[PDB]
Amino acid sequence: WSTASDPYSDFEKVTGRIDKNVSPEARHPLVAAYPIVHVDMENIILSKNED
Amino acid sequence: NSSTVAIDHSLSLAGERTWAETMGLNTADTARLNANIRYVNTGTAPIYNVL
Numbered sequence: 001w002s003t004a005s006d007p008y009s010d011f012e013k014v015t016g017r018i019d020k021n022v023s024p025e026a027r028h029p030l031v032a033a034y035p036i037v038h039v040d041m042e043n044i045i046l047s048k049n050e051d
Numbered sequence: 052n053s054s055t056v057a058i059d060h061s062l063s064l065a066g067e068r069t070w071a072e073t074m075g076l077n078t079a080d081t082a083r084l085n086a087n088i089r090y091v092n093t094g095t096a097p098i099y100n101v102l
Contacts, residue, residue, distance in 0.1 A: 049079040 004032035 002009050010029040012018045026033035090101060
């Protein structure tokens with residue numbers, strides 16, 4: 001139902017009946033459409049707990 | 052040759068008046084923010100249960 005196993009059917013992919021955020025190169029059925037989410041920590045604030 | 056005997060009584064009324072003053076603090080939790088805010092909708096649709 002999806003050739004790439006990603007949660008968008010080949011029909012949904014080629015016809016564009018899809019989440020629009022899916023980047024255009026992944027509209028093709030043989031190209032998997034998946035998020036890659038990494039967190040980066042811009043800075044770290046320690047506060048000393050002292051009475 | 053001498054021999055001396057002595058004997059003493061003492062009353063002592065001591066009145067004391069103390070004042071004291073303390074400021075405690077915690078360096079992690081030293082202040083509390085309370086932000087007054089207001090929402091605006093400059094768009095075209097209404098939005099419900101805004102958070």
